[PDB]
Amino acid sequence: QVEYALESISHAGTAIGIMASDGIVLAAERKVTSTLLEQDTSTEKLYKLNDKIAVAVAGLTADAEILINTARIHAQNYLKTYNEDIPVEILVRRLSDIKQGYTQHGGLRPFGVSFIYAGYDDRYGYQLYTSNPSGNYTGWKAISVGANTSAAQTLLQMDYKDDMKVDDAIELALKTLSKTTDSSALTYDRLEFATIRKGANDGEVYQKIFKPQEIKDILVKTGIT
Amino acid sequence: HITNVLSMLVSKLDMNDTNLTSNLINGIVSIAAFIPIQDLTGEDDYISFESDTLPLVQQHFYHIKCGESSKTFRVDDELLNNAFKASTTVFQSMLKVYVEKIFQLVDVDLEDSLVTKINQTTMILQESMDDKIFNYFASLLQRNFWSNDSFKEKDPNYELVTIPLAALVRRNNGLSKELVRTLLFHIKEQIKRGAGSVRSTSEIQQRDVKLVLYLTALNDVLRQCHESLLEYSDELITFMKYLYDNVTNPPLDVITSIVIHSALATLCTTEITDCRLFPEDSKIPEKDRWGGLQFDPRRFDKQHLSFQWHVPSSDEITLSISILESLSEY
Amino acid sequence: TGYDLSNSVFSPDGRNFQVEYAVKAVENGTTSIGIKCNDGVVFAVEKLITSKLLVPQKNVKIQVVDRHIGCVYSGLIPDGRHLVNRGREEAASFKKLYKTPIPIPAFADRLGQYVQAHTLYNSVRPFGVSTIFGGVDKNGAHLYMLEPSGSYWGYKGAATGKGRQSAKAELEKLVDHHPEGLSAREAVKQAAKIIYLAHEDNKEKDFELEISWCSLSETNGLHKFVKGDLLQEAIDFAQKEIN
Amino acid sequence: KLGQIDYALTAVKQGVTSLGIKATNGVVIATEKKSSSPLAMSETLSKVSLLTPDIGAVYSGMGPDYRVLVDKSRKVAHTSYKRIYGEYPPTKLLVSEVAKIMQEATQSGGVRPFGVSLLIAGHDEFNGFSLYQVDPSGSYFPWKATAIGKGSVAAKTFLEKRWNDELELEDAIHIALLTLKESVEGEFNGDTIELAIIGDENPDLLGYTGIPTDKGPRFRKLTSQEINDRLEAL
Amino acid sequence: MFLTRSEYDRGVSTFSPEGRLFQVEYSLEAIKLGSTAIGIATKEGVVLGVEKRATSPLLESDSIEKIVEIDRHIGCAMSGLTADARSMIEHARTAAVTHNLYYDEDINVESLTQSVCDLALRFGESRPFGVALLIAGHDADDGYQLFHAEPSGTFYRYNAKAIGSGSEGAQAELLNEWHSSLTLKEAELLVLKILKQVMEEKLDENNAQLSCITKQDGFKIYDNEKTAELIKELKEKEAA
Amino acid sequence: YDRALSIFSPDGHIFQVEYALEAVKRGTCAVGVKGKNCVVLGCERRSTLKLQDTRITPSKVSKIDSHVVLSFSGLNADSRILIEKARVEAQSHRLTLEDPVTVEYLTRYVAGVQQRYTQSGGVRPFGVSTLIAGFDPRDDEPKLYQTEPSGIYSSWSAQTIGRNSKTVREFLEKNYDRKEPPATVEECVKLTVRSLLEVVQTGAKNIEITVVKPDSDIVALSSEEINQYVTQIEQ
Amino acid sequence: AAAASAAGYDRHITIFSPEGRLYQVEYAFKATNQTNINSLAVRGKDCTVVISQKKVPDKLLDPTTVSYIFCISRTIGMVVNGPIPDARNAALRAKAEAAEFRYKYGYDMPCDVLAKRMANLSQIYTQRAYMRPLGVILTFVSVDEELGPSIYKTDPAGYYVGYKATATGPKQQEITTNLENHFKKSKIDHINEESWEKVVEFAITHMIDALGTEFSKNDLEVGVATKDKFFTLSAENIEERLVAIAEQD
Amino acid sequence: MFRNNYDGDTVTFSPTGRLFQVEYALEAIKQGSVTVGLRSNTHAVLVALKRNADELSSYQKKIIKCDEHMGLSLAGLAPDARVLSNYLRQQCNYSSLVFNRKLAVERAGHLLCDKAQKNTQSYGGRPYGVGLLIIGYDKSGAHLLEFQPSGNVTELYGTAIGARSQGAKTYLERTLDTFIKIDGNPDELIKAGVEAISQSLRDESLTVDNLSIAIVGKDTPFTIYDGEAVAKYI
């Protein structure tokens, strides 16, 4: 009795998550929009929850930002409570249960959004997950949500290998998006990009949510112009 | 029963119940389309709607309401024919109530289809009148058009009064000279009193409403003047120039430019003038014509369906070219 | 076309048809009148006798508010009882707070405001009564008629109910022929005449004439019923006049 | 598909034109002031409003709704931030509260949406100059330039031709007065136009001197004489 | 087949021109559609019986219970176990325990019957509410009592009452058979006889459940083995 | 065909949960049988899409406490909320009364939440059933229960909630007998095995089975033991 | 008098039509014409004036009670164009608002804050489907000490503005056009006379000249705003203004 | 074939000034079994014919005690008679503890009118569907009141309400001069009431359980007789 909310996200641009043997790779595409609508803002696709966890979104930013802020608040509260940062599984379950409630309770509306939660913690290592308006969630080796989901999942399935490096997951996300792009070329201003990797060399979790020039640099590595 | 019903329908038109008013207007137009709005009384001056028609409508209704049938109802053909002839003497009373309802409906938030239907019933009433009832109705309408309280609202239904005036002038060209000189006098009065002196692109302002009434009346009357424009053609051309000098509010430029369209259009158009139920106060199909020959097999007759029509004259064509090149070159 | 089904609504004319329909309820009520005298008010009503079983001394159509305000009404009977109770408690409220009898104009406005509030919300209906009320205070005699819309004015003489047309026409003759103003004794006689003249449209039912008065000379400005010989004298005046 | 909010949007699309333009060093918000009568004193109603000394608003749609909205928006900017944080909000915070006020009406049954769309413009230390459109829905969007009301499709086409990342506030005022000039229903002068900026601070309009910390309004409504001075070149 | 509708049908809280609330009438006839329950009151006890639905052999026990304990003194039977029946029962239970701790004395059966009717007038907190109940009990004032509590929030005391499947012929045989002089055994045999006739002539401990109120044991539901020897006592007594 | 005299709505009322109870048939098969000295639950595994990560997938069969286990058919998202509510209630009982939760109290509380989500009207009932099983503290009688979206609950000697669970129930009625049940865990396991291999939406990824034994001995059979149990006769 | 749940269509409750109109509010504008009374308000040099027609056709009325001019506070008054029950409601509200303001803020309620407050109340009645608009236009007048001579007009939509002059009623457009053509001639924002005797005199002249009918003492009503007194003229004082119009010309 | 547009709610008026929903609530009084009341100067009497559902059923209660000096009867609806009768009991208890008086039976009448008229004026509610005959004694003597669900109450020497009441009512109107002079003898007033109710039983017959009687006045508290106590009046 929620399937219209799952229809809603199918239009909302596209997000790809790919997990390597040594990291995770979030990529997402901004929908092309009016010349005068402001781009330099907080309402994007690739957000964050803590220094070990990042999300990409499909569905409306107004339903996303409440859950993103609830996740930031709950992750800050967990780090404050235990002095070790929240497991990815507990973040997605905590966010899967809040979302389930607003779908079963008829005094509320189902959240029209679906986030791809990438992360690292030592209880299970690197963890890639998807959650959707129903309040169910699944663990993945690769996943995508929103526009061109079906076409992208076939190209993911036929190229994904379990042993691949993070650099191969950079290539696979960029090459999947350049195969399944609605615009007949791909450019750094439509692309939001992030990685979660094992430090500079030592044991820490290192996020990067890439700046526009670093995106241009990986596009010219990967032969997309 | 029918003129008692026509009178009772016309008295019952509301300004709050647009659905009931639509259904009453369906009744009124259906009566008008079949019945002649005419007094069938000869030298029978002793008969009167009340005491002739009503006594036969109170006995008949009481008889059928108490469970008896019309087959049992017996009366002299003479009392029945006096009750019919006396039915027809009530039409001037009904038409005064009708014009008074038409001027009340100008203030109402109606719909384009109900306004169009109310215009059609007013025109079908007119085509069903003899010249005696038409000459009464024309003066009643013209008098109310000058002496009324009926354009106080933001956005009045001008058509409910101005299409009836244009329909008078289609039936009688002799009305147009006075109605066309009285309108342009009132337009000059309102323009000198300041109508169209305050700009707005989006709205006809409350001070512009009478100027718009007399201009839309002028547009509608001029469309039906034909060969009667030839009497006051120069006076209209110098008025058109005055109007194109003096008023420049963008909502009024559309209304004021329709004046030449209506003038030139009536001078070159070929179309029907006469739509009367019975022609020209002429012919002899008897006084038993409550039906308009609809079933009578003599409806197809050349002496019944001899319509005058309108065929553009050569003077009206020398004026149409004079207006067209004067205004365009102007 | 649905503007007349609920209470807040304006019709396209800008009138409230549920209050138009509430005054149709008033027009089905027993005729009642009031007269403003030189120093007071007289009230009169046609009390229709519905059966022999009604206890004759305890069905009273004229209603007392405080001690100086007389009241009478036409239309819904539960609605008239409710306005009379609002009236009694509104007057007792002012008497408790200010220790002095309520001005008739201030009393009238507190009712006008109450009745007007019942035209605002579609969660309620209007009152189905018109109230004629009046009295004597520091400024002398006052007579008021209040209607279902909350509308009220001061009157020289007031009439409401089924016989109101005939009563209004007679009251206009009182005002024309006595332009100085009537004495309370003559206003009693003349009120009896107007209730008998109103009953000739309704002769099929028995009635009792009921009269009360409140006059600064005859009653010290306290509202009281016309009883015994003066009532019978006013009946005998109405009875010679109706011939 | 239509409901009560698509009808509130039609009330906005019927309303008098207003616009906003964001420049390198400030923001413009501007509109036509239309008179019901030439006996009406047009100074006695304000189309453009101060919310905080660094946030201003302009509307299109139903003027009485906007007046109750701005009274509530001012009360919201006070009870929320002045009375607990000690300081005024960023434009983002006050736009969210305005959208929360507008969403509460569209939600409650036995209430109707506010028949207005708002352009809210202001300054903040972290975000800098900003312009937001708030619709009857209780939704908000950030804009580089925008227009609302009757003239909005032609105005937004001219704003798309003329906006660039390098405009100065003084040239954004020229673009704004050119954009209002084309849509004008009445006369075009300093008495029919209403125009404000959020730009540099104005220490005179602090109305007191001494305490070095306060700097006075970033917000400024132009007087009719300042508008007429610009209209001599426009 | 013809149509007999009316303009006042499905009118909620609305009188028809006759002064009828058709919603509460409709709710009050849906009592014909449920499972059959029967009550017999005697000077020796009140007997409640109900038809049980047949179940899989694997079903060991269930929380469907159409006969319920309200208190030691008071028992109850339903023709249906909707949420509204549960609501009325747990209100009646909370009403019994609150009266016990207020007066140090057992609730009268009329006063508990009144309380479940007040819940249906309140709609929990001219609507009908819930389901028909038979309410059985003993108190020192008015002895052994059997009440029909109705979805209308009104009730009657009966000497015997049938509800559920079988209504016209179910109460027809009860008024033919009931005596002031019935013994408890004889009343049990009578509810089993009535249950056999309504069930299109089937009778087992697997489709008949019995209970009684007495002063001495209070409310008790009979074991399958106790109803089985009673069914054999019926089978021989009719054949004799 | 209860039109009768073209009658409609003569009772003026409705009650309905059964949309949820249909989802409880659509969902994976779940079957449970008592022994003399054990209870075995077995549940169907859903086939997993090509790119899923299996490392964190829940066992479907779900421990509430060392002596008590829950399994379900119905919506997975709803089932989590019941398992989480049952886990916090089991910890809350174990704390506040200094003794483990009794299996019937746990079922009465799980039924209590399914009752409240029926009754409250502003929420749907949960689209799920429960198969609650185990042993009480200081006891060796095996205990086995069901709850349904209606908030009804019941005790079973064997039971099966699924889409093709009518033929499992016929095989259970054909071979189980409460006079002489499968005594040893060997028979008990082999009978839930025979049940699951009949009519489950099976594949190379197949069935998860858990034996419960008395005094908190709770054990999921290995992917080898569920294969060792495939002892056959064929002709 | 409590709020409750009830139904309606887009022209029986204040709800946007398919075209964004609020019919219940436009129909409350038609309710203002119902009494068939015209009124006029004009600014003097140090006063502001309000003139109303008075209709009392019914010989059975006490004419002293028929009154559309209301005293809100010592400084400020109003004329109502609409049904008397709604007028008495709006008057009782404006009196209570002014008394509550003089209590809290410590100076007498300005005429710009009373019109705004009453227009904000009318906006709450234009968005409420449980309560109707009032069928009234309210014209407030005072000689403020902040803005001087002041006219403020409020209507059933909760629109308000200040006015140089205004007329309200069934024939107001002719009064308004004749006032527009006066200010187009004199080029002031007021009537250039130093005493309220000459302004109430000029307003009665314009009312006669616009409506085409002479007034007896009883056909007119008058308001005279002066600093620390708004007041209404008795009929013998209005007689002075009427007798000063006949002697003048 | 017909469709009354003005009877859907208790707050609609007919175009003729009718409250149809209140009239339909008066039609509900003629659904219950007959009751009679009558009075003299010393006593007032109620008598009521009680129905049952079946021969195994107890009889439905028709007469209720509100205080030691007054009580009522209930034709039409049974559950609407307990809401009013409970309130009338509360108001009697309140008059004893707050004023040290017995509630006057006229005062009790106004309090019922008040409670009933409120339901007639408000949306979502329904006028009561019960007719009360109230009897009492107080310092003004013996009294009988007929309450009608519209919110009206009438002082009567006698009346009948319920199905087929016109028979008893017509007998009381014919017998009036006789039963109002029955003073110092309560049994003859009871017999005059039981003969009046016998005119409404069209072919039917009184029995101990089918008949209930009540009396109040002078030295006698309000008492109810039914069962064996009515045996001397059959």
Swiss-Prot record, chain B:
Organism domain of life: Eukaryota
Cellular location(s): Nucleus; Cytoplasm
UniProt record similarity statement: Belongs to the BLM10 family.
Function: Associated component of the proteasome that specifically recognizes acetylated histones and promotes ATP- and ubiquitin-independent degradation of core histones during DNA damage response. Recognizes and binds acetylated histones via its bromodomain-like (BRDL) region and activates the proteasome by opening the gated channel for substrate entry. Binds to the core proteasome via its C-terminus, which occupies the same binding sites as the proteasomal ATPases, opening the closed structure of the proteasome via an active gating mechanism.
Miscellaneous information on this protein: Present with 2600 molecules/cell in log phase SD medium.
SUBUNIT field: According to PubMed:12973301, colocalizes with nascent proteasome. According to PubMed:15778719, associates with proteasome core particles and also forms a complex with regulatory particle-core particle (RP-CP).
Entry remark concerning the domains of this protein: The bromodomain-like (BRDL) region specifically recognizes and binds acetylated histones.
Protein known as: Proteasome activator BLM10
Lineage: Eukaryota, Fungi, Dikarya, Ascomycota, Saccharomycotina
Residue span relative to the full protein: 661 to 990 of 2143
UniProtKB/Swiss-Prot annotation, chain C:
Acetylation listed as a keyword: yes
Major site of localization recorded for this protein: cytoplasm
Domain of life, source organism: Eukaryota
Keyword Cytoplasm: yes
GO biological process, one term: proteasomal ubiquitin-independent protein catabolic process
Localization per record: Cytoplasm; Nucleus
GO CC annotation terms, alphabetical: nucleus; proteasome complex; proteasome core complex, alpha-subunit complex; proteasome storage granule
Keyword line: Acetylation, Cytoplasm, Nucleus, Proteasome
Protein modification: The alpha and beta forms are probably products of the same gene with different post-translational modifications.
Disulphide connectivity of cysteines: none
One MF term in the entry's GO annotations: mRNA binding
Family of this protein: Belongs to the peptidase T1A family.
Function noted in UniProt: The proteasome degrades poly-ubiquitinated proteins in the cytoplasm and in the nucleus. It is essential for the regulated turnover of proteins and for the removal of misfolded proteins. The proteasome is a multicatalytic proteinase complex that is characterized by its ability to cleave peptides with Arg, Phe, Tyr, Leu, and Glu adjacent to the leaving group at neutral or slightly basic pH. It has an ATP-dependent proteolytic activity.
Any further remark recorded for this protein: Present with 12000 molecules/cell in log phase SD medium.
Name of protein: Probable proteasome subunit alpha type-7
From Swiss-Prot, chain E:
Phosphoserine modification, residue list: S56
Entry-annotated residues carrying Phosphothreonine: T55
GO terms for cellular component: nucleus; proteasome complex; proteasome core complex, alpha-subunit complex; proteasome storage granule
InterPro entries: Ntn_hydrolases_N, Proteasome_alpha, Proteasome_alpha-type, Proteasome_alpha_type_5, Proteasome_asu_N, Proteasome_sua/b
Subcellular location: Cytoplasm; Nucleus
Keyword Nucleus: yes
Keywords: Cytoplasm, Nucleus, Phosphoprotein, Proteasome
PROSITE patterns: PROTEASOME_ALPHA_1, PROTEASOME_ALPHA_2
GO biological process: proteasomal ubiquitin-independent protein catabolic process; proteasome-mediated ubiquitin-dependent protein catabolic process
Keyword Cell membrane in record: no
Main subcellular location: cytoplasm
SMART domains: Proteasome_A_N
Effect upon mutating G49D: In DOA5-1; slight decrease in activity
Any further remark recorded for this protein: Present with 17100 molecules/cell in log phase SD medium.
Assembly and oligomerization: The 26S proteasome consists of a 20S proteasome core and two 19S regulatory subunits. The 20S proteasome core is composed of 28 subunits that are arranged in four stacked rings, resulting in a barrel-shaped structure. The two end rings are each formed by seven alpha subunits, and the two central rings are each formed by seven beta subunits. The catalytic chamber with the active sites is on the inside of the barrel.
NCBIfam families found in the cross-reference section: PRK03996.1 (NF003075)
Family: Belongs to the peptidase T1A family.
Protein name per its UniProtKB record: Proteasome subunit alpha type-5
Annotated source species: Saccharomyces cerevisiae (strain ATCC 204508 / S288c) (Baker's yeast)
Curated annotation (Swiss-Prot), chain F:
Signal peptide: none
Subcellular location(s) of the protein: Cytoplasm; Nucleus
Keyword Cytoplasm: yes
InterPro entries: Ntn_hydrolases_N, Proteasome_alpha, Proteasome_alpha-type, Proteasome_asu_N, Proteasome_bsu_CS, Proteasome_sua/b
Modified residues (Phosphothreonine): T57
UniProt-listed Pfam families: Proteasome (PF00227), Proteasome_A_N (PF10584)
One Gene Ontology cellular component annotation held by this UniProt entry: proteasome storage granule
Cysteines joined through disulfide linkages: none
Source taxon at top rank: Eukaryota
Major subcellular location class: cytoplasm
Biological processes annotated in GO: proteasomal ubiquitin-independent protein catabolic process; proteasome-mediated ubiquitin-dependent protein catabolic process
SUPFAM superfamilies to which the protein is assigned, alphabetical: N-terminal nucleophile aminohydrolases (Ntn hydrolases)
Keyword Cytoplasm annotated: yes
Keywords: Cytoplasm, Nucleus, Phosphoprotein, Proteasome
PANTHER family xrefs: PROTEASOME SUBUNIT ALPHA/BETA
Function: The proteasome degrades poly-ubiquitinated proteins in the cytoplasm and in the nucleus. It is essential for the regulated turnover of proteins and for the removal of misfolded proteins. The proteasome is a multicatalytic proteinase complex that is characterized by its ability to cleave peptides with Arg, Phe, Tyr, Leu, and Glu adjacent to the leaving group at neutral or slightly basic pH. It has an ATP-dependent proteolytic activity.
Family statement: Belongs to the peptidase T1A family.
Other facts noted in the record for this chain: Present with 16800 molecules/cell in log phase SD medium.
Identification of the protein by name: Proteasome subunit alpha type-4
The species this protein was found in: Saccharomyces cerevisiae (strain ATCC 204508 / S288c)
